[PDB]
Symmetry: C3
């Protein structure tokens, strides 16, 4: 019922024929793609241009029922046509994409005795991006030097990793500093109830029984893997406690990379709560077919619409799969 609207350039664009919006905890800035395909059966499409182009670069919002889904910029304007077809589409990312694409211009080239939050405030400001803090960022860093051509995202992400926190964004394209949430979606995904379809992949191709980390050592065991499968790794950033932490990070990364579960539901809104499905919320999962019975963390959502209807694809992970400690 609620309509989905793209606003760009003081203009309003509704009636799209295909919409895909990603929100994600693992890919800074997510994505939107909107397409409108008209067919002209009089074979006179080329005499029947309808909208003025959406300029690439334009500030952009997508709303459902007046509620914000994504805030960013048009990356790509993508027109095409033939004798009986006009297709226009735009693609882009939320505001934080500037943090991913662009260089840090902080002329003194180093931060002194600053927390992650103070640094993020600095590098984000000339992009007009707000920094939201939802967790303890811990101690200041004594001295941080900008690497050559380092982007605001690459800097913040490396700092984040030394403080055991995560970087993401909100629906308003603000930078969010957080940790894996305790907040509940207010809903379960129950096989036979609200799950329209689902898909999984559970692998040991990248799983190992023992991670040995060497400076250039320390063993980190993964007791889930009951066959002899050793992995030795040099990591020149490494301390015996440091190598153990990097080994633990290594076990944790291989686990997340080896499990996938994606649930397709009807609607972008949770019917119980009436709230949009949201990343970094916890959702009980009861799925006998797949072999899941645990509370999971929503890591990503694909919100889509076509002729068939509105769907949301919810990618879920073990809630401590995105929880780390700190770097060297």
């Amino acid at each position: 019922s609620e309509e989905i609207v793209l606003k760009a350039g003081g203009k309003i664009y509704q009636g799209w024929t295909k919409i895909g919006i990603t929100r994600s905890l693992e890919a800074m800035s997510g994505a939107f793609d909107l397409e409108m395909t008209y067919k002209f059966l009089g074979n006179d499409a080329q005499y029947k241009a309808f909208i003025e182009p959406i300029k690439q670069g334009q500030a952009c919002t997508v709303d459902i029922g007046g509620e914000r889904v994504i805030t960013g910029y048009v990356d790509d304007w993508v027109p095409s046509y033939d004798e009986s077809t006009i297709t226009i589409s735009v693609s882009g990312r939320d505001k934080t994409a500037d943090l991913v694409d662009c260089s840090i211009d902080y002329p003194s080239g180093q931060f002194n005795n600053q927390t992650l939050t103070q640094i993020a405030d600095i590098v984000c400001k000339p992009f007009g991006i707000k920094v939201i803090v939802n967790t303890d960022v811990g101690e200041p860093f004594q001295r941080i030097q900008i690497e050559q051509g380092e982007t605001p995202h690459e800097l913040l992400a490396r700092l984040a990793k030394q403080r055991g926190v995560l970087l993401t964004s909100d629906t308003f394209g603000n930078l969010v500093i957080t940790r894996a949430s305790k907040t509940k979606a207010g809903v379960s995904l129950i096989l036979g109830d609200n799950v329209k379809a689902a898909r999984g992949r559970f692998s040991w191709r990248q799983r190992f029984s023992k991670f040995t980390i060497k400076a250039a050592k320390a063993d980190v065991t993964d007791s889930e893997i009951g066959r002899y499968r050793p992995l030795i790794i040099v990591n020149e950033e490494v301390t015996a406690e440091g190598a153990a932490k990097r080994g633990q990070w290594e076990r944790q990364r291989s686990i997340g990379k080896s499990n996938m579960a994606e649930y397709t539901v009807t609607g972008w809104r949770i019917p119980q709560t009436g709230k949009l499905w949201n990343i970094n919320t916890l959702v009980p999962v009861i799925d006998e077919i797949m072999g899941l019975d645990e509370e999971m963390l929503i890591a990503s959502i694909l919100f889509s619409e076509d002729d068939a209807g509105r769907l949301a694809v919810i990618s879920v992970v073990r809630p401590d799969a995105m929880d780390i400690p700190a770097q060297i």
Copy 2:
């Protein structure tokens, strides 16, 4: 007019599928030619209709008697099943050898030679001729051949230094040229002669400012890009503020061509007005309100295709300043 492949004293025409690509940006023209027969009877199945065309043979492709490819068959691609037999050949201009093969030049160095002189030397043993179409500029004081370097790789970096383009002609010669101002003799007009078109206009790789790097730094601004989007690049090759400005302009220019694409599909391979095949490196006026184009564009690439339905030219156009590298 037939498309004729000539190879090994033999002549082949009557292809059921054709794709011939020529490009200002490519080191060699390319072809793909296929003969298929379907719904074969019980006695017709599993029977060769042609002696295999051997890979590696010198060949030419002509369209209506006019050369479009002078090179070699790269690939012999036969296939069949219970009701079908398909044979296909693909290949490239002679200048393919400059892309595939190593420079063998015992001394490993050129001294006080121009791009042209160096090109002449490295192409020579492949029996490839160099055609010079533009100002090649100053000689290079000293050039070393890097380990395993190909003629294409060497000549490419030299052309980058001099602001010129490397391509081939229809005769398999190496052509050193620049973007021309030669007119195509026709316009691409929405509602007139365009069958289909597609485009992509992106700011993904566009920046508001290019800062290059010594003590020397220079800011080259891109006025097309109206959001704060800085890029900082260090180049240890630059030693001057004029050098840093020059590399910044080179970086800005490169980001344009990389960010825009437009492709026009028209009926037939020849321009009706002139009777000639569409040609690369010519200027074509484009009036197209759906894309958002109302200007002269440069033809960078053409695919001449044919199948069941008929013949199409797919013409890739770029803003002419995208081809002018300084």
Copy 3:
């Protein structure tokens, strides 16, 4: 002849989509087994857990011995799809690092070293050919896998590594053993496909180990010519390993034979997994006469790999054939 997966104390029958690869080119091959059940949102079997030891047989004959890599469940409103995939046991040699605290092998043959590195994986080494002289000193490269190490040794001894149906490591040579069947166009070939190219073929292979007024001259070098490429097409390759002129020529010839293999493809589709004339499964590393006027083949070819597949229509074997001379 039913095809079965034996894993986890059970024999699984009723697979509807099967793909099994045996290859001289890809250590460990692959299996993929899938079942689609048209029925709502209810598990009918228990998850087939990734990691389990497993066997695939056809008509009681062993085809692959290894582990389940992936458990790939899915479902929608009307169907449940269950999918497993894996490798052969030798996959552990491909995935994993060598854990050998000495770091070096002294005065050992290829066989002795293979005996050592396969042992903790529980993989028997089968030797079916003269492995030749011992190596004097072999150092294990940083994070070297057992297959990596043995593969670089095996090429210096003019031999090949593969696997048997029991997941043992096999050290062998291009075989003289005939398959007992010819592949003949109009006879037993359902479909075939080929690509014969000179894109990666060269006339001469040269392998090698402020301007100087007096450059240092000489150096370790060898030329190896490919008489079949009748045009000037030279390739110069700097191998930093090679310290001898004899070694560079052996590298050169290897490079020439590899180019031939890389440049030709021929794949024959036949009905069935067994050879009607012998009753045996098609086997890699056996010779097959090929007669084929469409492609232009009239030679004895070696089987380099087989894809055994099954679906709705029935069982096919895709036999990938190669010139023997460029394997020996």
